[PDB]
Design a protein around this ligand. Structure first.
Ligand code: FMN
Ligand code: D59
Ligand code: LDA
Ligand code: ORO
Length: 374
């Protein structure tokens, strides 16, 4: 397709000269105005997947942090993704840390960021999502597409749970699933909430508010859940890769105890010191250098949780091979971020194609058959 090619050229051009986050905001603006290309192709019936009763038309979505404020949901989805995770959002609008706060290393295909939860706040983003949902109702290309919402706490918030509860009550109705973000490295002391006790209490408080949305309501589910599933949002937790074996064991038990619907593995890491261009910069690292670390984390949690908790994969997914690696490791679905940064508009159509051809070679009937094979 020409359209993708022209954009890929324009993208590569902008990044040689212009600041990374400025380029991101520009392309979000292009998407907001619906000037981006569409992937109108039928997705392979053999590459569809699910997480419990949540159905994905294809196995690739966009990770949190990309469209933090959900100002670009239609256009990003129509690039060929089955879903997008907007946010992370916080109850109140927030600027984030000092710019510049995002840096790429092209040869390493890695990124580092210290954004610090910049977002327009829950109320504004909720209104954005509501507007998307009304558009989705009238757009052939948006049907069956999933939108999750990543939720977190404001910089100066002491009680994380109060912030999580607030977000759920505001935007929960419009979400297909909720992602509890306790793995950002750019909010001090946030990762401490991965402690078994705090985490368990966090998950239960979250599940409790979601359940309470349904009870206080008088309407049919048809009018209560203004989302894709027409059901209450599933609950996922996103984990950081920077833990020890024991911490991972402890968390796995809490996930089972609380009956969490899924786990996103994983967030950015801080253990990467091998990139010279990043030696003076603060933040969490993404991209190719994070792939092996993320994959191992998947195998471990898949094991610790006795294959009972569905897995959403994040970290260094660029190729169909990279994707199948996550899948054979235990993931049901994949999330992209770094891929779009380096491959551009074509990221979804390309990686879907590559994975389709690879499932055929390896003698898989469908995607679901490949989950957790290695
Ligand atoms: C600029 C930037 C912002 C991000 N913001 C969030 C976020 O708000 N919430 C979240 O859970 N993860 C966030 N992430 C982490 C990504 O969602 C993803 O998990 C990580 O980049 C690894 O995926 P990748 O290697 O394919 O890029 C962010 C990453 C980057 C680079
Ligand atoms: C360029 C960049 C991007 C990025 O590539 N964004 C983007 C890429 C595509 Cl292909 C489409 C849209 Cl709407 C946005 C995302 C986050 C950070 C950066 N960056 O700081 O370099
Ligand atoms: C230079 C102006 C004359 C041409 C008018 C603008 C052309 C835009 C049409 C793009 C259609 C793209 N589409 C929908 C096939 O993907
Ligand atoms: O907003 C951020 O700074 C951020 C959040 C997160 O979860 N992960 C990340 O790398 N950055």
């Amino acid at each position: 397709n020409p359209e993708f090619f022209l954009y890929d050229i324009f993208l590569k051009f902008c990044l040689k000269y212009i600041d990374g986050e400025i380029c991101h905001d520009l392309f979000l603006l292009l998407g907001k105005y619906n000037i981006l290309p569409y992937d109108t192709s039928n997705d392979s019936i053999y590459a569809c997947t699910n997480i419990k009763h949540l159905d994905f038309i294809n196995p690739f979505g966009v990770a949190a942090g990309f469209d933090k404020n959900g100002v670009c949901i239609d256009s990003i989805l129509k690039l060929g993704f089955s879903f997008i995770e907007i946010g992370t959002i916080t109850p109140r609008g927030q600027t984030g840390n000092a710019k510049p706060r995002i840096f790429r290393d092209v040869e390493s295909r890695s990124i580092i960021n210290s954004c610090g939860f910049n977002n327009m706040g829950c109320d504004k983003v909720t209104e954005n999502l509501i507007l998307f949902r009304k558009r989705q109702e009238e757009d052939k290309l948006l049907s069956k597409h999933i939108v999750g919402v990543s939720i977190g706490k404001n910089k100066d918030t002491v009680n994380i749970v109060d912030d999580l509860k607030y977000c759920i009550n505001k935007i929960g109705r419009y979400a297909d699933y909720i992602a509890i973000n306790v793995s950002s490295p750019n909010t001090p002391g946030l990762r401490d909430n991965q402690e078994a006790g705090k985490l368990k209490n966090i998950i239960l408080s979250v599940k409790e508010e979601i359940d309470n949305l349904e009870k206080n309501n008088i309407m049919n589910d048809e009018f209560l859940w203004f989302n894709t599933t027409k059901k209450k949002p599933l609950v996922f937790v996103k984990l950081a890769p920077d833990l020890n074996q024991e911490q991972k064991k402890e968390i796995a038990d809490v996930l089972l105890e609380t009956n969490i619907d899924g786990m996103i593995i994983s967030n950015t890491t801080t253990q990467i010191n091998d990139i010279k261009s990043f030696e003076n910069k603060k933040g969490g690292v993404s991209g190719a250098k994070l792939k092996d670390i993320s994959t191992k984390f998947i195998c471990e949690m898949y094991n610790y949780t006795n294959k009972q908790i569905p897995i959403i994969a994040s970290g260094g997914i660029f190729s169909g091979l990279d994707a199948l690696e996550k899948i054979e490791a235990g993931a049901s679905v994949c999330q992209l971020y770094s891929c779009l940064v380096f491959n551009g508009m074509k990221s979804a159509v390309q990686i879907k194609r590559e994975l389709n051809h690879l499932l055929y070679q390896r003698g898989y009937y469908n995607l679901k058959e490949a989950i957790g094979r290695k």
